[PDB]
Design a binder for this molecule. Sequence first.
Ligand SMILES: [Ca+2]
Lengths: 137, 137, 137, 137, 137, 137
Amino acid sequence: QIANVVLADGQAAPADKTFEPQRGQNGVTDPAEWWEKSSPTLNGYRRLTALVRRNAASKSVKVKVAIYDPTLAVTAPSTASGIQPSPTVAFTCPVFIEFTLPDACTIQNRKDILAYAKNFLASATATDLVVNTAPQY
Amino acid sequence: QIANVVLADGQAAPADKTFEPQRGQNGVTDPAEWWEKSSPTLNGYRRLTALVRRNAASKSVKVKVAIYDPTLAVTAPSTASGIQPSPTVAFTCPVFIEFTLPDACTIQNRKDILAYAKNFLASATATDLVVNTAPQY
Amino acid sequence: QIANVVLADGQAAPADKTFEPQRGQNGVTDPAEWWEKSSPTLNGYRRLTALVRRNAASKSVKVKVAIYDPTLAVTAPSTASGIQPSPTVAFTCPVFIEFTLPDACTIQNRKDILAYAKNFLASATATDLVVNTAPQY
Amino acid sequence: QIANVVLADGQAAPADKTFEPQRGQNGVTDPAEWWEKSSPTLNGYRRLTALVRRNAASKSVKVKVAIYDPTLAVTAPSTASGIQPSPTVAFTCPVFIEFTLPDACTIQNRKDILAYAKNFLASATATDLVVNTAPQY
Amino acid sequence: QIANVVLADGQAAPADKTFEPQRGQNGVTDPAEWWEKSSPTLNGYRRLTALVRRNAASKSVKVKVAIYDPTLAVTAPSTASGIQPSPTVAFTCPVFIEFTLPDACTIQNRKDILAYAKNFLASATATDLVVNTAPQY
Amino acid sequence: QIANVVLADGQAAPADKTFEPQRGQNGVTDPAEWWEKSSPTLNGYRRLTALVRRNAASKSVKVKVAIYDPTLAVTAPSTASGIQPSPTVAFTCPVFIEFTLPDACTIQNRKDILAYAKNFLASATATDLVVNTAPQY
Ligand SMILES: [Ca+2]
C-alpha cells in the first residue's frame, strides 16, 4: 500500500527528506507520484515516480522509478518592466531506474537484482562515477 | 581508476559477488565493463557496464550504469540429433540507471541525487516494487 | 602512473592549486586530464592536459601539455529576468607546451631540454614577456 | 631593451648556458632570436626565439617562445691528427611555448598563468612526463 | 591492476630485464605496453604489448602479445672523447603470440592451451627451431 | 631433424602429452606437423605445426608455430536417429607464435628473444591474461 518514503540526502550527516504521496498507480498508464514539499512553491518540490507495468509482448514486468531534484535560480527584487519574479527552476538533476523481470523468474532472482543495484549505488565506484563525473580509466 | 567492484546479492546472508574489470571507458562511445566469472562459461558471467559521457547539446553530463544478471537454463544429457548442449541463457534480469547532471550543478547536488537513489533502492517500497512486482495502491 | 599535480599561482604569497586527476591517458588518441575543482561549478575548474604519443613517422615521441586557467565572468542577478544566470566563462588563459624527443635521444638531452624550458619560464625575460606583454626590442 | 639570457642545463650541477642576442624582435613580424654559440661549429649553437604580437581581430596577445637544442654526430670518432669528418646535425630537441592573453586580462591573471607554467615545468610530474618519457596512466 | 613484467634473457646466467608499465590497456582498442628502458637511447628500449578483446561476432576472446627486442648499430665504434655518431636501429627481433578462446570455453582448456604454449617454447625442439635457425626435416 | 615433442598440460599434476611426428617439413611451402593421438579418432588429435622459412624480401627468417587443442563435443546416441554420430569437434583452442630473425641476427639475440617469449608465457601476468581472460587495466 502507499505511504510516504523517506530518503536521506548526501551530506556529512544525512538529512531525511520525506516524499508524501500525491498519486496512486492506476492501471499501467499512470505512475504513482510523491512530492517533497520542502520549498514554498511547487517548483521546489522534489519528485519521485514509480510505475510497475506488465509488458505482455516480452512476457515480463517492467519497474520504472524516477527521482527529480530541482534547484531554484537566484532571483532579484527588481525585474525589468514589471513585477518581482516568482521562483523558477534553474535546473534539475534526475535519476531514472528501470528493472525488467521475466515471468519465469525467481523471487531469489528479484532480490539478487535489487541488491546488486543498491549495493552498487552505495559503492565508491558509483560515487566516483556520479559525484566526480569521472570515467573508469 | 578502475578496479573490480563487489556487490552483495539478495539473500538472508549476503554473498559478495566480485566483478573483475574487462574494459576501460575509452572516449564516450565505449563504456567500461566488469565480468563476474562465477559460472564456467561466458553466458553465466554477470555484467556491469558504466559510461560517463558529456552531452554538449544539453550542456550536461550523463552517467549510464547497467547490471545484467543471467540465469542459465536446465539442460539434458541427450539432445536431439546430435551433441550434449552447451550451457545457454534462459533469461536475464537487467537494471538500467541513468543520472544526468547539468554543467551548473553543485557537488552537493550530485551527492544529494546519488544518495536519494541509493536510499530509495534500499527502501522497503523499492523492495515491494521490484521483488513483489507490485504497484503502489 | 596518474596522480594529482600541485601548481603554485603567482601572488604575494603563492597558493597551491591542486589538479586532482579526473581522466587518465591509457591510449594514444586522447590526452590525460586534471581538474582543479576550486570553483563550485564545472566551468570554473582549472584544467591540465598531457599527452605522450609515439609518432612513428618522424621516429619520435611528442609530449603535449596544456594549462587552461578560466576567469569566471562576474554573474549578477538579471536586470531583466530578475534571475541570475548559471555561471559562465568570460575568457580563459591557456598555455600550450610541446616537446619533441627523437628516437635516438639521450636521457641527458631530455633532461637538458626540460631544464631549458623550466629555467626560461622562471627567467625574468619570460616575466617581461608574458606578465608585461612586452617584446624584446 | 633586449638582453642575453642564461639557462641552467640538466646535470648534477647545472652549467649556465648563455644565449647572446644575435637579433632582436623586428616588430610584430619577426621574433627575437638568441644564440648560445658554445660549440665550434654553427651546428651546435642552441637557439631561443620569442615573439609578442597583438592579434587585433581576436583582441588578444600571443606570446611564442621556442628553445632549440641540437645534438651533433660525426661519421666516425675524432682523431685530432689528420683531416677529420665534419659533423652533421644528428637531431634537435625543441620546446615550443605559447601563451594567449585576451585584451581584457588582468596583470594578476598574467602572473598566475606564467606561474602555473613555470611551477609545472619544475614539477616532478613534468619530469616523469618529459625526462622519463612516460605518460600518466 | 597493471604491473611491470620481468623476463630472463638468454645467457649463461639469465639477466632479469624489467619492463616498466608506461601505458595500460586503453579498453578494447589500444593494447597495454611495457618499456624496458635499459639502453640510454630511446632506440634500445625493449617493448611488450598485450591486448585482450572479445570479438562478439565470433563469440570469442583474442589475446595478442608482442615482444620487440631492438639491436642498435653505430656508423663507427664509440670513442668516448669527442662528438660521436648517434646510433641507428640496426634491426628488431619480434615475437607475436595470439590465443583465441571461444566463448563456451573451459578455464581448464585455457590452462591447457597456455601450458602447451609455454612448455613448447621451453622445449629443445623450439630451441633447435628458433635459436639454431633449423627446421624439422 | 624431426622427433616427437612432449608438452605438459596444465593441472594439479601435469600430464605429458606426446605429439608423435606425423609429417615432416622438407620444403619451404608446407610446415611440419605433429599429432597427439590421445583420442581414438583423427578429430581428437592435438596438433603442432612448425615452419621455418627464409624470406629473401626482408632478408630474414620467419618461424611460425601453432598448437591446436580441440575439445571433442560430447556425442550421445541420437535422440532422433537412435544412431550415435561419428565424433565431432565442438571447438578448438589455438596458439599462434611467430618469431622473425633478420639476416644480421646474433645467436645471442635469438637466445634472448626465445627466452623472453618462454619466460613471459610462464609469467603470472600471462596467466592472468589467458587463463583468467583478464586485461591489464
Ligand atoms: Ca587504471
